[PDB]
RNA sequence: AAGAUGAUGAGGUUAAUAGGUUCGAGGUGGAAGCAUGGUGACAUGUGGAGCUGACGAAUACUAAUCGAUCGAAGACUUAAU
RNA sequence: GUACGCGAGCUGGGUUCAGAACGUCGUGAGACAGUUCGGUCCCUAUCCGUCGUGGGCGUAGGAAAUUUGAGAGGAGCUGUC
RNA sequence: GUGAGUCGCGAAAGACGGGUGAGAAUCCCGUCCACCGAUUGACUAAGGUUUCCAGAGGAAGGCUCGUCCGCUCUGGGUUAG
RNA sequence: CCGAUAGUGAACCAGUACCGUGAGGGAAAGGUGAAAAGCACCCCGGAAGGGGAGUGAAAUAGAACCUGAAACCGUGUGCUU
RNA sequence: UUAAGUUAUUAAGGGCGCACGGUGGAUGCCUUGGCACUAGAAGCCGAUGAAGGACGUUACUAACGACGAUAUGCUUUGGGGA
């Protein structure tokens, strides 16, 4: 329904340890000298 | 629904207008009160 | 099997896609739609290499009754050209064209995006 | 040495950006360009404009080379708050709080 | 074969993982077209025909690339040795 | 027995509402030892708890497999011939 | 500030191509598909009072975006025996 | 006697903007600098914006411009977990 | 090498303190404007058409103010002197 209490600064931050994003995996082109994704296309 | 205030210029140009107010002592008094303050607008 | 939308909208989508891809022989879409249409169009070329009446009578069950064409100041309704030009290419070959290219993502929807041929 | 480049009161909230910063807080430059340019987010391209500017002036004014450069510290801070309303049932309202950000990036060779 | 996600499991070209192909199982119940006979609606023969989602064998024909990351070098003391 | 177990799980027939009527008491407004038809049941679950499922670290070098059982839980019915 | 990157994002069928553009699920053209059809169609009156047209813009709004707009700037548009 | 949440309700385009049909009710809102000398010109970018450059005694006084606290929000790190 | 025993390192992330920014606009200083009073003056206008308003006038004017188709003011007399 509702909270009873002010969520602190701490558990607010502990609640967010897994809010990240895993960086993409990249690969330099075959002789075009720049990165792009794996099993994707370069554009 | 039918909401209130289905407007019309004629009834408004009437009752809440001027010539009524300036055709009754009461209305004259009203316009006075609206002057001593200083109001840009009358009959509205 | 796979679901994009409701039932009718699904098949009419597909009919517009295989009816597409054939004026201009390559498109760009979400990835999934490319997969189910992969299945479909492969069934089409495998069908299109017979040439029977009944093959036309069966192919029309998804293509659109009308799709005008102009390439060399000429005319083709996606079916003339199918059964004159397309199967002619892949006579030697088995059904199993239609590669897929994971072209890239999209910005507004975060959508994956592709092209197929 | 050092170098920096800033945007000011650009129209994105901090958090949604703050992530994309913590991707690259430490790494070499062009690797970071790669890291930004791909991620399916609206917060990315802007920041590439920022960083790219930091390289422009880091070369023009301070006479550096792109090789030894990394991102030692980058961050975002709050800006003003565009306060707006949404209507809501039974006459009430509940006011949106649109926010902004003052993005800050600081290149460094680390050397002198 | 698992499943909300992630996880799990089969697989990733030295390859049958999925798709398609050809076959098949089962389902459906005699395709269109032709010919015949009926003025006709209709039937008969072509013919267990033809069609077929998830199912099942062979088939690399297509796509599973290339690439990147993480990850130990063995504490001390005593007793055997 | 556990808020005569449980309404942030359900229902609302009853019941402490507004209407109306019967008997009765009251001069009257109106009210009952009573009776009768109808009469709106809100909530996006924060913490604890619970059901399930995962990441990190540790388990004196780093990994793939297999397994013991400290303990815990579930099962425990009965008839006829 | 927390709640929370959560609830919701206000009925409904769109898809493709080509262009413009710093940049397009959403903008313009074309193509098909679908929806209303005693009516989401058409002419009027009340009512509102410049929203109308064209050219430029895209910080604010527009429940996303936006090269676009009933938004911003400049100019222009309403004729009665 | 006040020196900007005080004093007028109002230090500024105030009985205005706005709410109401209408009597009527009714706001908030001060400070660049000595002087505007208000950042030529260069670089990045579409612009916004920024860094350089310079004016000025000073720009961490550059117009959402004297000072600029706290809440709140981040960055980094010495001890610890 | 073998056994027995003890101990730590880790920090995903958080904590305490220190430094540096950001928001936001308290405090400090100031004042254009107000408050209450003194002394004095004055204390009503209007058919000779009031008070108050509308609409319009500046080369460029959206508003305030001035003004009224002689319109962002005309003539006169006095003062001032750029």
């Amino acid at each position: 329904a509702v909270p009873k209490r002010r969520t602190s600064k701490t558990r607010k931050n502990k609640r967010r340890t897994h809010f990240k994003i895993s960086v993409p995996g990249m690969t330099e082109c075959p002789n075009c000298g720049r990165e792009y994704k794996l099993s994707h296309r370069v554009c | 629904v039918k909401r209130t205030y289905q407007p019309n210029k004629r009834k408004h140009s009437k009752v809440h207008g001027f010539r009524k107010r300036m055709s009754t002592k009461n209305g004259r008094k009203v316009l006075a009160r609206r002057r001593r303050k200083g109001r840009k607008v009358l009959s509205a | 099997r796979k679901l994009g939308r409701t039932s009718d909208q699904r098949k009419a989508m597909l009919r517009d896609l295989a009816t597409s891809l054939i004026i201009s022989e390559r498109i760009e879409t979400t990835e999934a739609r490319a997969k189910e249409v992969r299945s479909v169009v492969e069934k089409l070329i495998t069908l299109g290499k017979k040439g029977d009446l009944a093959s036309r009578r069966n192919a029309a069950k998804t293509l659109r009754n009308v799709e005008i064409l102009n390439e060399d100041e000429t005319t083709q309704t996606a079916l003339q050209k199918l059964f004159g030009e397309i199967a002619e290419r892949y006579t030697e070959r088995q059904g199993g064209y239609t590669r897929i290219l994971k072209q890239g993502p999209r910005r507004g929807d975060g959508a994956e995006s592709v092209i197929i041929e | 040495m050092e170098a920096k480049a800033v945007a000011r009161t650009i129209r994105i909230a901090p958090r949604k950006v703050r992530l994309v910063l913590d991707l690259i807080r430490g790494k070499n430059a062009a690797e970071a360009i790669a890291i930004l340019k791909l991620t399916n987010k609206a917060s990315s391209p802007v920041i590439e404009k920022v960083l790219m500017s930091a390289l422009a002036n880091a070369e023009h004014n301070y006479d550096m080379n792109t090789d030894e450069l990394v991102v030692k510290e980058a961050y975002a801070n709050e800006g003003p708050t565009l306060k707006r309303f949404r209507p809501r049932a039974q006459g009430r309202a509940s006011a949106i709080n649109k926010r902004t950000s003052h993005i800050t990036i600081v290149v460094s060779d680390g050397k002198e």
Side-chain angles (χ1 to χ4, degrees), chain D residues 11-86:
Chain D
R11 178 64 184 81
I12 302 171
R15 298 178 66 176
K16 297 176 180 286
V17 177
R18 188 169 287 179
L19 300 171
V20 177
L21 271 69
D22 77 7
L23 291 172
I24 56 82
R25 189 173 291 105
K27 277 64 62 172
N28 186 4
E31 290 81 356
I33 293 168
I35 290 161
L36 299 186
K37 185 176 60 52
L38 277 60
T39 304
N40 308 118
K41 289 183 176 289
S43 299
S44 67
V46 172
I47 300 167
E48 179 61 28
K49 303 288 183 289
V50 178
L51 190 155
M52 188 66 204
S53 183
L55 299 176
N57 61 8
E59 289 180 354
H60 188 275
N61 291 313
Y62 300 172
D63 298 333
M64 290 184 176
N65 58 2
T66 187
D67 294 334
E68 295 181 352
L69 292 176
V70 307
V71 175
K72 67 183 286 294
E73 69 187 3
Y75 55 86
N77 280 319
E78 289 84 5
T81 71
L82 276 294
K83 291 192 286 186
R84 298 288 192 278
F85 294 170
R86 296 296 303 173

Side-chain angles (χ1 to χ4, degrees), chain C residues 7-17 64:
Chain C
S7 67
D8 303 334
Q9 303 181 4
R10 187 168 56 234
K11 67 186 290 297
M13 184 183 287
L14 296 172
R15 289 182 60 180
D16 189 79
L17 292 171
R64 298 296 183 185

